[PDB]
Write an enzyme that holds these catalytic residues in place. Structure first.
Site, mmCIF file in Angstrom:
data_model
loop_
_atom_site.group_PDB
_atom_site.id
_atom_site.type_symbol
_atom_site.label_atom_id
_atom_site.label_comp_id
_atom_site.label_asym_id
_atom_site.label_seq_id
_atom_site.Cartn_x
_atom_site.Cartn_y
_atom_site.Cartn_z
ATOM 1 N N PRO A 1 0.952 136.143 2.523
ATOM 2 C CA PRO A 1 0.024 136.991 3.285
ATOM 3 C C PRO A 1 0.526 137.295 4.693
ATOM 4 C CG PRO A 1 -1.167 135.258 2.140
ATOM 5 C CD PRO A 1 0.291 134.926 2.016
ATOM 6 N N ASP A 2 -0.123 138.295 5.297
ATOM 7 C CA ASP A 2 0.215 138.770 6.633
ATOM 8 C C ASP A 2 -0.264 137.769 7.682
ATOM 9 O OD1 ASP A 2 0.409 140.078 9.069
ATOM 10 O OD2 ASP A 2 -0.618 141.893 8.402
ATOM 11 N N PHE A 3 0.668 137.237 8.481
ATOM 12 C CA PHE A 3 0.344 136.169 9.428
ATOM 13 C C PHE A 3 -0.251 136.660 10.743
ATOM 14 C CE2 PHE A 3 4.758 136.966 10.796
ATOM 15 C CZ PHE A 3 4.627 136.948 12.170
ATOM 16 N N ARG A 4 -0.236 137.963 11.011
ATOM 17 C CA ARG A 4 -0.872 138.507 12.205
ATOM 18 C C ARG A 4 -2.284 138.998 11.940
ATOM 19 N NH1 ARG A 4 1.927 138.078 16.329
ATOM 20 N NH2 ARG A 4 4.209 137.923 16.181
ATOM 21 N N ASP B 1 9.489 134.874 6.902
ATOM 22 C CA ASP B 1 9.499 134.178 5.623
ATOM 23 C C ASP B 1 10.879 133.998 5.006
ATOM 24 O OD1 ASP B 1 10.091 136.783 4.434
ATOM 25 O OD2 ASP B 1 7.952 137.214 4.465
ATOM 26 N N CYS C 1 4.325 148.973 -1.095
ATOM 27 C CA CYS C 1 5.731 149.074 -0.714
ATOM 28 C C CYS C 1 6.655 149.024 -1.929
ATOM 29 C CB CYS C 1 6.091 147.980 0.291
ATOM 30 S SG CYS C 1 5.469 148.280 1.931
ATOM 31 N N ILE D 1 5.867 144.238 3.172
ATOM 32 C CA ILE D 1 6.964 144.084 2.216
ATOM 33 C C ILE D 1 6.965 142.725 1.536
ATOM 34 C CG2 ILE D 1 8.340 145.803 3.460
ATOM 35 C CD1 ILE D 1 10.484 143.469 3.720
ATOM 36 N N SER D 2 6.140 141.793 1.988
ATOM 37 C CA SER D 2 6.123 140.454 1.415
ATOM 38 C C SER D 2 4.814 140.087 0.742
ATOM 39 C CB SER D 2 6.436 139.403 2.489
ATOM 40 O OG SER D 2 7.755 139.574 2.976
ATOM 41 N N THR D 3 3.780 140.926 0.841
ATOM 42 C CA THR D 3 2.508 140.572 0.223
ATOM 43 C C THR D 3 2.632 140.461 -1.295
ATOM 44 O OG1 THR D 3 1.898 142.889 0.497
ATOM 45 C CG2 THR D 3 1.022 141.317 2.098
ATOM 46 N N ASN E 1 9.035 139.800 9.964
ATOM 47 C CA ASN E 1 8.626 138.729 9.068
ATOM 48 C C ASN E 1 9.416 137.461 9.352
ATOM 49 O OD1 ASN E 1 7.047 140.690 7.916
ATOM 50 N ND2 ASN E 1 8.277 140.886 6.055
ATOM 51 N N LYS F 1 0.835 151.132 2.939
ATOM 52 C CA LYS F 1 -0.461 151.380 2.322
ATOM 53 C C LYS F 1 -1.290 152.373 3.120
ATOM 54 C CE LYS F 1 -2.741 147.813 0.745
ATOM 55 N NZ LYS F 1 -3.124 148.299 -0.608
ATOM 56 N N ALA G 1 4.900 142.879 7.311
ATOM 57 C CA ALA G 1 4.259 141.999 6.337
ATOM 58 C C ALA G 1 4.001 142.687 5.003
ATOM 59 C CB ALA G 1 2.939 141.487 6.895
ATOM 60 N N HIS H 1 10.728 138.665 15.343
ATOM 61 C CA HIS H 1 9.749 137.631 15.634
ATOM 62 C C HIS H 1 10.292 136.245 15.322
ATOM 63 C CE1 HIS H 1 6.179 140.702 15.592
ATOM 64 N NE2 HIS H 1 7.092 140.961 16.511
ATOM 65 N N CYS I 1 18.558 113.269 20.020
ATOM 66 C CA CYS I 1 17.890 113.002 21.290
ATOM 67 C C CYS I 1 16.395 112.720 21.171
ATOM 68 C CB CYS I 1 18.120 114.166 22.262
ATOM 69 S SG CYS I 1 17.120 115.598 21.877
HETATM 70 C C1 LIG Z 1 5.379 127.564 6.869
HETATM 71 C C2 LIG Z 1 6.272 128.664 6.374
HETATM 72 C C3 LIG Z 1 7.608 128.448 6.090
HETATM 73 C C4 LIG Z 1 8.364 129.513 5.637
HETATM 74 C C5 LIG Z 1 9.809 129.360 5.271
HETATM 75 N N1 LIG Z 1 7.827 130.730 5.475
HETATM 76 C C6 LIG Z 1 6.529 130.830 5.777
HETATM 77 S S1 LIG Z 1 5.809 132.409 5.529
HETATM 78 C C7 LIG Z 1 4.047 131.996 5.397
HETATM 79 C C8 LIG Z 1 3.284 131.974 6.705
HETATM 80 O O1 LIG Z 1 2.486 132.856 7.005
HETATM 81 N N2 LIG Z 1 3.574 130.913 7.517
HETATM 82 C C9 LIG Z 1 3.116 130.749 8.807
HETATM 83 N N3 LIG Z 1 3.505 129.725 9.520
HETATM 84 C C10 LIG Z 1 2.936 129.785 10.770
HETATM 85 C C11 LIG Z 1 2.115 130.837 11.023
HETATM 86 C C12 LIG Z 1 1.385 131.135 12.272
HETATM 87 C C13 LIG Z 1 2.088 130.740 13.557
HETATM 88 C C14 LIG Z 1 1.657 129.641 14.262
HETATM 89 C C15 LIG Z 1 2.246 129.266 15.459
HETATM 90 C C16 LIG Z 1 3.282 129.985 15.977
HETATM 91 C C17 LIG Z 1 3.775 131.127 15.302
HETATM 92 C C18 LIG Z 1 4.851 131.890 15.808
HETATM 93 C C19 LIG Z 1 5.310 132.983 15.131
HETATM 94 C C20 LIG Z 1 4.730 133.365 13.934
HETATM 95 C C21 LIG Z 1 3.687 132.656 13.409
HETATM 96 C C22 LIG Z 1 3.172 131.513 14.071
HETATM 97 S S2 LIG Z 1 2.034 131.837 9.616
HETATM 98 N N4 LIG Z 1 5.711 129.872 6.217
HETATM 99 ZN ZN LIG Z 2 18.161 117.140 20.469
#
Ligand SMILES: Cc1cc(C)nc(SCC(=O)Nc2ncc(Cc3cccc4ccccc34)s2)n1
Ligand SMILES: [Zn+2]
Ligand SMILES: [Cl-]
Length: 295
Positions: A39-42, A115, A263, A32-34, A113, A232, A30, A132, A169
């Protein structure tokens, strides 16, 4: 007998430009994208999941779990709309990896990542292990169908607040990200088994190496392979309580180097040592200009 003449960024650059360094593996997270505004999704400290109560979940972590998604997909898709980045401009770090590709040095980029910025920056499917998963493609969840949908189609569903259903379907369509309860892609294990026999340099950028099995990758490198962390904070050392970890600082350190900072600034500093600063500046400015000009 060690491959780096000194345990510094300057030592890594000299090694990269010697005949000994031909294949680089990047491990990226994460950090590398901040600077791209993603932001960091974990992280529970980045303010992404502060307002989950609107979704009426049985427990907060349910929104990450695959069984809950298949039963109640609406919270996930509303969250995806709330978190959807307003722009996708890869960072200096992403374009440094494109330069590694252009220079014939990139064996593989393993990313945590989702994204898609690696692909926007010009890394191709063959170059990438999205450990992931990714939003780049989505699939119908029915095993007999598995119709694939591009991000343009999934984005339209997300922003129109229509739960995405397969046109063939009518099953749910799910982004190809790894929910809790799903396995990591087979490609991760297949590529790791081959790539780590061939690596000359591990470039670890923007990851604190805390989520498994992505973190255990560093122990898969040959003993001689130098490992440069651009991050960092120092990361990847053995845990004093729990226990091939990074050794940056002891008298036995011989191959691991930590560059502590943003980064983008670390990659800029490395490119400068390599004589690539003008090439990197020109690439970033032209790609950013193209992205800003999308009409
Ligand atoms: C919506 C979107 C679309 C694109 C192209 N790029 C992004 S990057 C920004 C961001 O943080 N997004 C996020 N969407 C869902 C997130 C939590 C999440 C929830 C449930 C399961 C997860 C399974 C695996 C990973 C995360 C999961 S965080 N976000
Ligand atoms: Zn289908
Ligand atoms: Cl991490």
């Amino acid at each position: 007998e060690r491959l780096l003449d000194e345990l510094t960024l300057e030592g890594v650059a000299r090694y990269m430009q010697s005949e000994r360094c031909r294949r680089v593996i990047c491990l990226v997270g994460a950090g590398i994208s901040t600077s791209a505004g993603i932001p960091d999704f974990r992280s529970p400290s980045t303010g992404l999941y502060d307002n989950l109560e609107k979704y009426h979940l049985p427990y907060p972590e349910a929104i990450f779990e695959i069984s809950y998604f298949k039963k109640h997909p609406e919270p996930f898709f509303a969250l995806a709309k709330e978190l959807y980045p307003g722009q996708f401009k890869p960072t200096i770090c992403h374009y440094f990896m494109r330069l590694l590709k252009d220079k014939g040095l990139l064996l593989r980029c393993y990313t945590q990542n989702i994204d898609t910025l690696e692909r926007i920056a010009g890394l191709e499917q063959e170059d990438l292990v999205e450990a992931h998963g990714t939003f780049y493609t989505s699939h119908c969840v029915s095993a007999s169908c598995r119709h694939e949908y591009p991000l343009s189609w999934m984005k339209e569903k997300i922003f129109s607040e229509v739960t995405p259903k397969c046109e063939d379907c009518q099953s749910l369509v799910k982004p190809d990200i790894v929910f809790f309860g799903e396995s990591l892609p087979a490609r991760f294990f297949s590529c790791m088994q081959s790539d780590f026999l061939k690596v000359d340099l591990l470039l670890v950028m923007g990851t604190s190496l805390q989520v498994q099995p992505f973190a255990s990758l560093i122990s898969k490198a040959p003993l001689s392979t130098p490992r440069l962390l651009i991050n960092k904070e120092k990361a990847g050392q053995s845990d004093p309580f729990l226990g091939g970890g990074m050794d940056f600082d002891s008298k036995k350190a011989y191959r691991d180097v930590a560059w502590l900072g943003e980064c983008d600034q670390g990659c800029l500093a490395l490119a400068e040592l390599l004589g690539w600063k003008k090439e990197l500046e020109d690439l970033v400015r032209r790609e950013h200009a193209s992205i800003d000009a999308q009409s």
